[PDB]
C-alpha cells in the first residue's frame, strides 16, 4: 500500500527543486528559453474568405 512516499521521495523532491530554479529565473537571464510564436489562424480578426 504505502510505499506512497517512495514515489514521492522519488519525483516530488526534484519537481520542487527544479522549478524553484525556474520561477525565480526565466526573467533573470536576458534571453532565456526561446519559445516560438503562436501561429495565429484566421479565427481572430480575419475573414476567410474562401473556400476556393
Amino acid at each position: 500500500y504505502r510505499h506512497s512516499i517512495f514515489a514521492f521521495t522519488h519525483v516530488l523532491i526534484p519537481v520542487w527543486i527544479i522549478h524553484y530554479y525556474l520561477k525565480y529565473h526565466v526573467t533573470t537571464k536576458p534571453y532565456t528559453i526561446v519559445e516560438k510564436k503562436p501561429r495565429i489562424f484566421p479565427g481572430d480578426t480575419i475573414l476567410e474568405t474562401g473556400e476556393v
Partner: protein, 152 residues
Amino acid sequence: MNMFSSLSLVTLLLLTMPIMMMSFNTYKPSNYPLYVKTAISYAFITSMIPTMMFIHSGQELIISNWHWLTIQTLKLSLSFKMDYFSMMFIPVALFVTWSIMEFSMWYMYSDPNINKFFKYLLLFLITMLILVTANNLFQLFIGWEGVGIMSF
C-alpha cells in the same frame, strides 16, 4: 507553458538519481534492479505529458542555463532542444527501454554482477538521450563519443 519545459528535465534529472544513490544512499538491496525499473516507469508517463502540450500549440523551447567557459567571442554554455525530433522520439526511446530491462531481468537473473550491469546499461540510455536534445554543436559531441565508448 511554464510547466512545459520544466517537466522535460524531470525525465533527465531523474535517471541520474539511480547513480548518485548507488554510493551510500542506504541502497535498496538486491532487487536493486526494481529500484531502477520503477525509476523508469514514472519517467515515461512523465515524458508522456509534454507530448500532448506540443501537439496543441507548437511552441518548442531551449534553455540558456549555465555558462561554461567563454573564450574570445563565441560563448558556449549548454542547452537543450525540444524540437520536433525531440518531442516524439524521446518518449519512444524510453518506452522500449521500459520493456527491455524486464527481459534482461529474467535473462541475466543468475549473474552475480547483475547489480552493476544495469549501471552500464543506464549511462548508455542517459548519454544517448543527450544527443537528441542538444542544440549546441559541441554538446552533440559529448554524447556522440559517450556512447561510442559504451559499446566497448
